User: Which sequence fits this backbone?
């Protein structure tokens, strides 16, 4: 396949796009919806089919003023773990900022009792909050399998470290519970990670050529949004921060001449040829945003192929232009 | 062209779909967005292109509690009148129901000072409310030109007539002011117009074969939602209700075996061949709505060709199935 085989932007008005190619021959898609009020799934046999795929709501936010999970439903990811579907997402009990001017999200998990994850809301049950030793702002969780274990990777505020959030990892006791104390892998520190907000968020994991590559997003969700990357040997101690190497420069960023601003909160999938790696990310096409960029709904989902360098590292290149007619 | 050339649903999660093919060949699209908080426009060179067309916000709702136009921005239509762009839309000052359990919408108009209607929000000016002699619930306004005059057609509640709204016509003094007293063209009365809720709304006008054909939607918005049609000779007194003929049966209804439930609030356009008439409407693929139905976002935009009967009347057929892969 080639980039031009896909009509971009693939999915309008969907941020934090997550695509999972399942064994049933379907691509499953989850993302943040503009009103941040529910979790819906789309499915199609092809990536282009997702642009017209009728969604199904499988979980709705709790009522206003009812406590946990009642506001700002962010970045759900659908995972298939030991034959069961799980969705990891973040939510807050309020839209109010705390005394540090931050969002009040925590991490949640829902589990499906059916082989079809899109049949009905009644098939999904809440496990509640995925707790961490320190109860602070946490979001954008993802999971990956390595060394016959399940790892959980997420973004969280540490009061002792400057900025909004750092990336952590921990091994899981089960799909909704941590077994180990969190380990910090990266914090915002370079100029490209600290524009408007000091942020490391949106982790995603790729496994290839004897290594795990963990991409993440940094800076605010406007034009400054960019992707960084950590690398680790697949057999190392994943819970030792010295096992991981951090890229000093972004691995993916704005392509300003073609009006692709702030690419980020990515995921990875495979094309319909079963071989080409695909980068899935959101991106904006203008910068004259009014108000908070999180409430402008025009982060659009993009998909494009990526390749591999001779040293076995990924080469993401740059955002491709829109090509709809 | 043929129905299979279009990937349906054309535009997911857009209700009250309005497509206008401009003299430069662009297809412009306006609709109610699921959060009902703004007016955005998409443009593409093809109807399928609209599925991936990056929207632009051209007008946003007024702040909460500030009065007119502050809530529930519904059903915008983009019209090109005497070389200027106008958008007719409905809005409320509140989300609360009136003492009769009804929505509190009134009709509004904005005008653009630029040839490009998607350049900037600063290009649009508010004309305010389009006032009617009785100040009651009103929405879904459309306009058409006939006999060198401009006619305004809309839906409005009459306290003396059972149901949520009837269809009215009036001649306009200018694009934001009525010249004549409203004339009622149809009220909900047939069995197929009064299922669960008594309503006539979403008017649309088609001109062909010496007649104007005014379609509208009736009944509740589940599988009972259906389209009616009025017919009048193109040279008749359009303000005399006795010039108009009401179809005693619906002209378009649910296609129950393929789960196309409740087609309505239509508009009309022309295909890329410049010849084939296209019906544009919203429709659901399920009716088992959970939570507040106002915020279930899955009314999807459908497009399909229609044809003409021997007597010069349109034949809409029935909803086509989804055909995305
Ligand atoms: Mg994620
Ligand atoms: Mg309309």
Assistant:
């Amino acid at each position: 396949v080639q980039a031009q085989d896909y009509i971009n932007p693939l999915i309008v008005q969907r941020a934090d796009p997550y695509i999972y190619k399942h064994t049933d021959g379907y691509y499953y898609f989850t993302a943040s919806v503009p009103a941040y009020n529910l979790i819906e799934i789309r499915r199609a046999k092809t990536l282009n089919g997702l642009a017209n795929a009728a969604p199904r709501t499988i979980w709705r936010k709790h009522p206003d003023g009812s406590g946990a999970m009642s506001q700002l439903i962010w970045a759900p990811e659908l995972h298939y773990i030991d034959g069961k579907w799980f969705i990891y997402f973040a939510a807050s009990h309020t839209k109010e900022f705390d005394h540090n001017g931050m969002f009040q999200h925590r991490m949640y998990c829902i589990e499906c009792d059916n082989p079809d994850p899109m049949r009905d809301e009644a098939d999904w049950t809440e496990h509640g909050q995925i707790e961490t030793p320190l109860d602070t702002f946490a979001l954008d969780a993802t999971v990956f399998e390595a060394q016959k274990k399940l790892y959980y990777v997420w973004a969280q505020k540490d009061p002792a470290i400057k900025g909004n959030s750092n990336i952590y990892i921990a091994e899981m006791a089960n799909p909704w519970t941590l077994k180990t104390k969190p380990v910090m892998l990266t914090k915002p520190e370079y100029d490209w990670e600290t524009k408007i907000f000091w942020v490391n968020e949106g982790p995603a994991v790729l496994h290839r050529n004897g290594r795990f590559f963990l991409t993440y997003s940094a800076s605010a969700t406007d034009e400054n949004y960019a992707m960084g990357m950590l690398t680790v040997a697949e057999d190392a101690d994943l819970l030792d921060p010295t096992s991981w190497s951090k890229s000093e420069t972004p691995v993916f960023q704005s392509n300003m001449p073609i009006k692709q601003f702030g690419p980020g909160h990515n995921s990875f999938t495979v094309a319909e040829d079963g071989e080409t790696d695909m980068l899935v990310y959101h991106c904006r096409n203008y910068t004259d945003i009014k108000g908070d960029p999180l409430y402008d709904p025009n982060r659009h989902t993009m998909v494009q192929p990526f390749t591999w360098n001779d040293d076995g590292t990924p080469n993401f290149g740059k955002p491709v232009p829109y090509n709809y007619k």
User: Anything to note?
Assistant: The radius of gyration of chain B is 18 Å. Chain B has one domain: 1-325. The interface with chain A takes residues 7-10, 12-13, 33-35, 44-46, 48-49, 51-57, 60, 120-121, 285-286, 290-291, 295-298, 300, 322, 324-325 of chain B (CB under 8 Å). Residues A 16, 18, 75, 77, 140, 142, 202, 204, 265 surround magnesium ion (ligand 1) (CB under 6 Å).
